Structures are given as C-alpha cells and as structure tokens.
Amino acid sequence: AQYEDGKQYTTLEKPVAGAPQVLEFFSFFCPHCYQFEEVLHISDNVKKKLPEGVKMTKYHVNFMGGDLGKDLTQAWAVAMALGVEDKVTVPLFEGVQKTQTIRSASDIRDVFINAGIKGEEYDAAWNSFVVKSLVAQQEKAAADVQLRGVPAMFVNGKYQLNPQGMDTSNMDVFVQQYADTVKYLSEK
Question: Domain range holding 1?
Fold first, then answer.
C-alpha cells in the first residue's frame, strides 16, 4: 500500500498496554533531536495534524550524557510539573549543544531562572515527590518500548515511527510526511 509496516513505521512485537497516545522521546544531548525540535519543529507540526481528543506526550531519556543526562530528565520533569516546557526547551537545547554553557545541575537551573521561574519554586519542584514519580514515568515509558535510540516516536503503544524510510531532500516535505504518518497511525 502507501503506508506499509516496515517502511514509514514499524510494529512493536511486544505491544505496550495503557501507553500514551502519541509518545515522543528525546535528549538535549541528541544532535538529531536538536534538529527535530529547533530546525524541523517535528513535535509542533505533528500536533497540528492530530485528530481531536489526541494529546501528545514528550519524554526525556537517561542513556545520553551520563550524569548530566539524568539531571536533564529530572529538570524536564520539573519543566512538566510547572508547565513551562515552551520556555525552557530552546535554551536547554542551545545551552547543551550550541553555546555549551550547561555543564552541571546549577547551569540547568540558571536556564529556568533566566526563563523567569522563581528559584525557590524550581528548587521545591526539583526536590518534590511529584517530580520523582514524573521521572519514574519517563523512565518506565522508555523501558516499556526497549528504547535504545532517540529521537523516537510511538503511537498507541503499538507503532514506532521509522523516519529512515522517508525522502530527506526537502525538510518541509519530510516533516509533513512524518506528521501525516503519525496521523494515519493514530486513526489505525
């Protein structure tokens, strides 16, 4: 057909019950992820084509960047708990990959301070249990699909996007094909 298993997407041999409907994984250390977020705006363009009643979940992963990678997953939990993803996503990517001024938990914190999140509010979130379980949720989801590489996107715990099987000559076109695949898979 037009959409074929093993081409634009793959099927999980081991489907995950109760999974979020659209689940994206990333790392602020991941160069392709920087592209996906900063240059291609994949997350954004997917959302604009999702049917109504379908919400998008995006999680950070641990297996890149060692110690600071883990710090970044907790900080993403904090970003989620406070609902400030859209203010820290860009400075976190650029701080890790562009300017390389993020080398420690303190430098991660600065980004939030600069973004206007109050220090005492960041620190309370950071140390909170709600954030601890939010870290556990991110790790569980990654574990459940046996995630060993990012960026990655899964739909209804049953399908995994396969971007390798798409023309990259034009970026806009790749992006829409990606978004359209997510939409088709969402209706499946």
Answer: 1-188
